[PDB]
Amino acid sequence: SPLISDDIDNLIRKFNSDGVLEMLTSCQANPISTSQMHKWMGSWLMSDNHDASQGYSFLHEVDKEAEITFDVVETFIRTDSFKILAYLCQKFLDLHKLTLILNAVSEVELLNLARTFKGKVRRSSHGTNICRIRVPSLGPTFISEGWAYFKKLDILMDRNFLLMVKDVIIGRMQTVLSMVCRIDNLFSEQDIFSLLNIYRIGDKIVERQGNFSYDLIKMVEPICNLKLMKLARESRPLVPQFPHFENHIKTSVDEGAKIDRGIRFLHDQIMSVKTVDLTLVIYGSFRHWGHPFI
């Protein structure tokens, strides 16, 4: 379903002027407006000022089972990025738990989930339930009837916004996994860091421009397609230039850089990529800064 600001807007308006309103009151909430929520996400996605112990443990259990799998393979035939990945894994675990709680179909499943994830449930005035749970990357969280309020961040999310954020984290994990789950050893850690650096540059655009960032983030697709054409012409030098598509990119980025210089950085980083293969990884990550309110 479409990502809209309307429901969050309407609830915040009602609050500072049903069972969820009661929940916000109890927390002494002061939710930031929807026009600030993407800015928060930009600042948060690759943040590392939180507990990631479970993320480390996760990434250690997985990489030890993967190294058993690869052990089976070679039986037949015959670190720096690890930290950044641990924090992504922590955020995934946190968002996954919150989603399960948020999507509890009944009171009985809600209670089981709350027990499992060390959450507490209490009754609202309208026969509804409020579940409170602490997660390392987001702080104390209060969930009721499709809503999640983050007391430490003063952020109110509806189901869709929370899902949008989880899709970004899953996406970035997937891209990193894709670069390591190879049988041809195609990518180096340097290549992984090239991708992480691109994430970082784009996140700063989101942090600074908020919902308006996506006008610039959308340019990753045509920048990458131009880069693919330039790479192609490196190997087959007699393929004709396409001055109009190239000039469209140039003017698009030139104008966008007046809004946020980050899109110049993104353009230039993509243009510095040495292979079709890494360029396609970046291309395939074009949704990995999320989606705007529409």
Curated annotation (Swiss-Prot):
Compartments, record wording: Virion; Host cytoplasm
Domain of life: Viruses
Impact upon substituting residue 221 to A: Almost complete loss of viral transcription
Sequence similarity: Belongs to the rhabdoviridae protein L family.
Free-text comment on this protein's domains from its UniProt entry: The RNA-dependent RNA polymerase (RdRp) domain is responsible for the RNA sythesis. The polyribonucleotidyl transferase (PRNTase) domain is responsible for the initiation of transcription at the 3'-end of the genome (priming) and pre-mRNA 5'-capping during start-stop transcription. The methyltransferase (MTase) domain is responsible for the cap methylation.
Subunit composition and interactions: May form homodimer. Interacts with the P protein; the association of P and L forms the polymerase complex, positions it on the template and allows to package the L polymerase in the virion, since P acts as a bridge between N and L. L binds loosely to N and is further bridged by the P protein, which interacts with L and N oligomers simultaneously.
Record function comment: Multifunctional enzyme responsible for RNA synthesis (replicase and transcriptase), cap addition, and cap methylation. Also performs the polyadenylation of subgenomic mRNAs by a stuttering mechanism at a slipery stop site present at the end of viral genes. The template is composed of the viral RNA tightly encapsidated by the nucleoprotein (N). L is packaged into virions during assembly and translocates to the 3' leader promoter to initiate transcription after entering the host cells.
Protein name: RNA-directed RNA polymerase L
Organism from which the protein derives: Vesicular stomatitis Indiana virus (strain Mudd-Summers)
Residues of the full protein shown: 43 to 363 of 2109
